[PDB]
Design a protein around this ligand. Structure first.
Ligand SMILES: [Mg+2]
Ligand SMILES: [Mg+2]
Ligand SMILES: [Mg+2]
Ligand SMILES: [Mg+2]
Ligand SMILES: [Mg+2]
Ligand SMILES: [Mg+2]
Ligand SMILES: [Mg+2]
Ligand SMILES: [Mg+2]
Ligand SMILES: [Mg+2]
Ligand SMILES: [Mg+2]
Ligand SMILES: [Mg+2]
Ligand SMILES: [Mg+2]
Ligand SMILES: [Mg+2]
Ligand SMILES: [Mg+2]
Ligand SMILES: [Mg+2]
Ligand SMILES: [Mg+2]
Ligand SMILES: [Mg+2]
Ligand SMILES: [Mg+2]
Ligand SMILES: [Mg+2]
Ligand SMILES: [Mg+2]
Ligand SMILES: [Mg+2]
Ligand SMILES: [Mg+2]
Ligand SMILES: [Mg+2]
Ligand SMILES: [Mg+2]
Ligand SMILES: [Mg+2]
Ligand SMILES: [Mg+2]
Ligand SMILES: [Mg+2]
Lengths: 186, 51, 126, 142, 234, 103, 144
RNA sequence: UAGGAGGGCGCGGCGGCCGAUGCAAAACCCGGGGCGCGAGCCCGGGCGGAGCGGCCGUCGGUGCAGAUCUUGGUGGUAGUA
RNA sequence: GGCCGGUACCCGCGCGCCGAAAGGCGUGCCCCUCGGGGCACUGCGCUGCAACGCCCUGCGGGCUCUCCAUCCGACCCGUCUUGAAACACGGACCAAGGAGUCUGACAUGCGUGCGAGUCGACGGGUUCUGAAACCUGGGAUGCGCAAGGAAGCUGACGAGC
RNA sequence: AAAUUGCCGGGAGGGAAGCGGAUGGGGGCCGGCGAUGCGCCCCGGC
């Protein structure tokens, strides 16, 4: 008998290989296993750990934010382990070099017609294996519509969480608990 | 061009050697052990050999 | 046809793990079923009652699935898959499957004698 | 393989026509691969005869005494199955078979990986033919 | 071809570089063993110097009319004697902080008002006292394990200390033993490096663990007699 | 009810299992309509298979006011001004809708 | 995929995963939303605030058509004009956009605009859409 | 324990792949030999006399010792009342 | 004396001799100065401890199978229960059937496709084994891209630490 | 097929039997249950 919690065995969990059995993703996984093992670059470590992500932990990043992130850093290669969607709200995109999993077929055309070069992670591993002069990025995680529902309950003070409502309107959860004149103001 | 040198060397756990009564190992842990023992014995030598 | 295993096969238990109370009844099969009772002396593991299978009774990985022959068995239905044990005859043992004909068994055994593959069924169906 | 070898492996590492798997998917699983151009017939990416450009086969020939075929895949002709394998019917004795196999596998840096395994299979095939000729003179158990 | 010759060039470079590292490290070990020899010689010399010094002082005080009060011990050896069952939660925390998380573990402790009043709170569960040189050294030798990268690495060679310490000017087992016993400026690190000694059950038995050592039992101070107990825990 | 979820609106308190309508006959209606269209085309050969002519009209309703669609028939004013008699227009493949007004 | 349902793993465990003490009876809380005001009160007034009661005035025979205002922000207007007729333009000459031809009634004023002038021709405009278009040098033509 | 999850074993189909079978398939019986910690599997012998299995994907009316469970059979009571 | 282990690394062996062998044998510097002791220059390689038995178709060896004896243990399972072996309830035994499934809405999590789009789901044209498959519309059908108000109505002028 | 019954052969029983762990004594059954082959050599031809 020894005084330990669950015999000391780690009770947290993390991904160690993507649930996705996409063969191309498994091949990237093997490549970056090699790189993080023989190279000891923290950048490769982060890239690996982020290929071991779900699609709700890999939200899309659009150019209207990518260009923000590339404004004055055209020498460094942009890396987004996720998706690049276009954004019809921007007009002039600097010729930028971005590496990503996927490019929406209109965003890839936008980048090519702007004159940048549009990479995949193997092409990234060619000319930045340790990640020389690279700019790692993540898309907005808590921007997902589902997240607007999370946190402390809708009906407690100071909470600004969207309650699950089957439709908007006057009759759908406006009456008692949302105003002084019927009951109380949440 | 960037990988560190490959490491094929497998280091297993080393068998235990008696750290108190194995001469070879006690002289790798405490190299002065033999000198202290010799001093003590060579001090006993006179203390007995006198009488 | 000489065994490659160079480690003595050790078994932490040879007796089977018969189901608790398989003895008093006939309808209960001998196969093990974990006793799910709330007051079951077997589940509470009082001494003197049947032993359950743990993982602790597991056998060594390097001496696992070796027959008493010191070969791992591999069941073959025909000459086609008999012949693919050329470079495993020191570690794998063919067994001709239970539903082949005696005619095909003669052929497989003849083929295995010249490929020098240990077979435990060469005296079957004759 | 029009696609690369690693991709072919990730495509066929779990099911293919040449894979004989028995005893379930538990710790008891036994896996062999029975394509002609796999040497140990061990189903691994080293020995896989489908996921590789450069593969060697060592087989006893058709009904005829003591003729061994050594075949190596032609890397460049690879999308031409009829002209995909360079097959080599040799019938000389064993020492000159081993020198030629070393010539075709290891010495030209075709695929030194399978230097020792190809020769081991050559020994097994040769003595298999030798005993098909002579008979069971030795019990081969000591 | 070019591919394999290019591979082999680096293979040659690495072979040479590894050989020259071995050549350097042989000289390193050859000088380091003389350094260790010197340190152990002087540690032993001051062991006898202090041992004669105590008798010298006590005799001098008796001669000059008064008496010499020995300097109270700087170090405690604590060994837990009660199991992990039926513990008040505050006591459970005290033991988890002292690193006594299993019966018949031994830890080395600084003496100070912070820690000795911590033992005060948990005396029914530990037996503890004043280790001497033999006890400390042979604990370190025969049951020495090091908290190396959270793993328990046996202290079977001098090299483990190069990794665990060496930012603290502790290089051999004898430095570790000295720097514990004569509670040093780095005792915290050279104890947290040590893994709780997992000791044998007391040979020859054990008196009643329910009572205090004064009343006949075993818990609490037995100041000098942890020495007498260790030879049968070890 | 239990953990945070929408307030259910299950309208399954009647005997809905007596009125479930399954669509396994969807391919069957497709094929039957196709057959009916062939056997109408052969009969009305050589008339146009879409039927008589239909007017360009505007939809109602602010949401679709700008979106033109085929109506039901030409008005009397339109037939008269295009020079085609009322009773003859439906004869020669021209629908007539006496209810529409030309505004 | 019944071969995956966790009921299958709960075979042999007497309670099928619903507890021995508190069993799995028909409807121990009531059918549906039973007792919103009474014993599910904690639930309804924690997670669905505002559920109970009337607010607002009735509107007999609503048509959703009457309320149809598809809107477009200013930031997206320039996507509507093709690049060719963005080139066929200068400082004094600017393209004219009929949003009603695109299915939009109102033109709202969210986001940036390029400095290039544009004449958006809508049915409804906001204050801020006009202020941004004028400040960009364009103009507005109201049609319907 | 209540409970949760992972990995597997097993039954019956479907889309595929590899096979077995009148020189004996399925089933069932055995003081037969084994493998796995275990669900279970493999082989041997007998009866049997025409079908059957393995692997991958996938699907399901899929696993029994209880429910005074349902149908059918059989006991002890008993050669007794 | 007990138990375990028997070596690709710590040990050990060869590259000299004597010695069956344990093993002994060189040179130079420090120490006592007797006896001897300490230190030193150090390199290539190789590197699974042995001796002898017994039996080998035997009346042999061993077996996880069967019966029996003996020592130790050992209350009858499922269950409601703080508590069941209970003088709590169900169960005489066997065989077969036998209990979280289907559908709708929603939600989180995960996978796939696309991604300010996305759905072809009602229809239409095709469809030479086919209730399949493939094509088609959509310029606004569903959801999403704008929200706040009861409503008239208004509807995000561009972020720093 | 089992429940269940009979006959034959075996086994054991001082107010239960059955089951777990030890071996021991009976059985019954296992030749992949357990080997005879490697190197060196000389012919005698293959
Ligand atoms: Mg333990
Ligand atoms: Mg309030
Ligand atoms: Mg209980
Ligand atoms: Mg004793
Ligand atoms: Mg006592
Ligand atoms: Mg007490
Ligand atoms: Mg009803
Ligand atoms: Mg449970
Ligand atoms: Mg549940
Ligand atoms: Mg229940
Ligand atoms: Mg409940
Ligand atoms: Mg209750
Ligand atoms: Mg009330
Ligand atoms: Mg069922
Ligand atoms: Mg059943
Ligand atoms: Mg039953
Ligand atoms: Mg049950
Ligand atoms: Mg009660
Ligand atoms: Mg009672
Ligand atoms: Mg009751
Ligand atoms: Mg009863
Ligand atoms: Mg749309
Ligand atoms: Mg910041
Ligand atoms: Mg019977
Ligand atoms: Mg009697
Ligand atoms: Mg017994
Ligand atoms: Mg026995």
């Amino acid at each position: 008998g020894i005084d330990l919690v669950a015999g000391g065995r780690n009770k947290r969990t993390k991904r160690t290989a993507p649930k996705s059995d996409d063969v191309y993703l498994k091949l990237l996984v093997k490549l970056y296993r090699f790189l993080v093992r023989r190279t000891k670059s923290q950048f490769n470590a982060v890239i690996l750990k982020r290929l071991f992500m779900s699609k709700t932990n890999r939200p899309p990043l659009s150019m209207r934010r990518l260009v923000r992130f590339m404004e004055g850093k055209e020498d460094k290669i942009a890396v987004i382990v996720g998706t690049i969607t276009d954004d019809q709200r921007v007009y002039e995109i600097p010729a930028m070099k971005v590496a990503a999993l996927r490019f929406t077929e209109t965003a890839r055309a936008r980048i090519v017609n702007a004159g940048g070069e549009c990479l995949t992670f193997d092409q990234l591993a060619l000319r930045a294996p340790l990640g020389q002069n690279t700019l790692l990025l993540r898309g907005p995680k808590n921007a997902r519509e589902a997240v607007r529902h999370f946190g402390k309950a809708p009906g407690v003070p100071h909470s600004h969480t969207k309650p699950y409502v089957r439709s908007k309107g006057r009759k759908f959860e406006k009456a008692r608990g949302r105003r002084n004149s019927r009951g109380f103001k949440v | 061009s960037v990988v560190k040198p490959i490491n094929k060397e497998v280091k297993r756990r080393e068998a235990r050697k008696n750290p108190l009564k194995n001469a070879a190992a006690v002289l790798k842990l405490n190299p002065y052990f033999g000198t202290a023992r010799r001093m003590a014995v060579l001090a006993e030598a006179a203390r007995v050999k006198a009488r | 046809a000489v065994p490659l295993l160079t480690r003595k096969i050790v078994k932490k238990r040879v007796k089977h793990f018969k189901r608790a109370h398989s003895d008093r009844y006939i309808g209960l099969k001998q196969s093990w079923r974990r006793p799910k009772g709330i007051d079951s002396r077997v589940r509470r593991k009082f001494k003197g009652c049947t032993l359950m299978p743990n993982i602790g009774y597991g056998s060594d990985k390097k001496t696992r699935h070796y027959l008493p022959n010191k070969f791992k068995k591999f069941v073959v239905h025909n000459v086609s898959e008999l012949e693919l044990l050329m470079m495993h005859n020191r570690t794998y043992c063919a067994e001709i499957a239970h539903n082949v004909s005696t005619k095909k068994r003669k052929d497989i055994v003849e083929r295995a004698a010249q490929l020098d593959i240990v077979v435990t069924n060469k005296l079957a169906r004759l | 393989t029009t696609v690369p070898g690693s991709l072919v492996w990730e495509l066929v590492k779990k099911n293919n026509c040449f894979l004989i798997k028995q005893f379930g998917n538990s710790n008891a699983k036994v896996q062999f691969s029975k394509e002609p151009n796999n040497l140990y017939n061990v189903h691994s990416y080293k020995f896989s005869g489908l996921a590789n450009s450069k593969t060697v086969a060592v087989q006893p020939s058709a009904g005829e005494d003591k003729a061994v075929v050594l075949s190596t895949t032609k890397t460049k002709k690879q999308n031409t199955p009829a002209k995909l394998q360079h097959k080599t019917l040799m019938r000389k004795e064993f020492r000159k078979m081993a020198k030629s196999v070393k010539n075709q596998v290891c010495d030209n840096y075709y695929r030194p990986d399978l230097t020792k395994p190809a020769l081991a299979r050559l020994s097994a095939v040769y003595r298999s033919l030798q005993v098909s000729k002579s008979g069971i003179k030795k019990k081969n158990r000591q | 071809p070019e591919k394999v010759i290019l591979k082999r060039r680096r293979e040659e470079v690495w072979a040479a570089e590894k050989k020259q590292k071995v050549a350097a490290e042989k000289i390193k070990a050859a000088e380091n063993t003389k350094v260790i020899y010197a340190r152990a010689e002087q540690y032993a010399g001051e062991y006898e110097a202090q041992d004669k010094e105590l008798v010298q002082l006590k005799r001098e005080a008796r001669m000059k009319g008064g008496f010499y009060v020995s300097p109270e011990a700087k170090l405690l050896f604590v060994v837990r004697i009660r199991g992990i069952n039926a513990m008040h939660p505050k006591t459970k925390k005290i033991l988890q902080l002292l690193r006594l998380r299993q019966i018949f573990n031994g830890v080395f402790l600084k003496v100070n008002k912070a820690t000795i009043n911590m033992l005060r709170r948990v005396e029914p569960y530990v037996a503890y006292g004043y280790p001497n040189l033999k006890s400390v050294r042979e604990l370190i030798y025969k049951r020495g394990y090091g908290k190396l990268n959270k793993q328990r690495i046996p202290l079977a060679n001098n090299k483990v200390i190069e990794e665990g310490l060496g930012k603290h000017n502790i290089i051999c087992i004898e430095d570790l033993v000295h720097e514990i016993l004569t509670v040093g400026p780095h005792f915290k690190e050279a104890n947290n490096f040590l893994w709780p000694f997992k000791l044998k059950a007391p040979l020859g038995g054990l008196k009643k663990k329910r009572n205090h050592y004064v009343e006949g039992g075993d818990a609490g101070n037995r100041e000098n007699y942890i020495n007498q107990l260790v030879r049968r825990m070890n | 009810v239990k953990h945070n979820n929408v307030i259910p609106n299950g309208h399954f308190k009647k005997h809905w299992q007596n009125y479930v309508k399954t669509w396994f006959n969807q391919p069957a209606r497709k094929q039957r309509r196709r057959i009916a269209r062939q056997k109408k085309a052969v009969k009305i050969f050589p008339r146009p298979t879409s039927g008589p002519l239909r007017p360009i009209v505007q939809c109602q309703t602010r949401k679709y006011n700008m979106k033109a669609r085929a109506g039901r028939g030409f008005t009397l004013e339109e037939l008269k001004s295009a020079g085609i008699p009322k009773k003859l227009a439906p004869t020669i493949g021209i629908s007539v809708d006496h209810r529409r007004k030309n505004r | 995929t019944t071969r995956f349902k966790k009921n299958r793993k709960k075979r042999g465990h007497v309670s099928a995963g619903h507890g021995r003490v508190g069993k799995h009876r028909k409807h121990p809380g009531g059918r549906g939303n039973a007792g919103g005001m009474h014993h599910h009160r904690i639930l309804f007034d924690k997670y669905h605030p505002g559920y109970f009661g009337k607010v607002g005035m009735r509107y007999f025979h609503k048509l959703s058509n009457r309320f149809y205002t598809p809107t477009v922000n200013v930031e997206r207007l320039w996507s509507m004009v093709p690049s060719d007729k963005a080139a066929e333009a200068g400082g004094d000459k600017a393209p004219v956009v009929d949003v009603s031809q695109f299915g939009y009634f109102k033109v709202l004023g969210k986001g940036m605009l390029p400095e290039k002038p544009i004449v958006v021709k809508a049915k409804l405009i906001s204050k801020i859409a006009e202020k941004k278009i004028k400040a960009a040098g364009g103009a507005v033509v109201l049609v319907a």
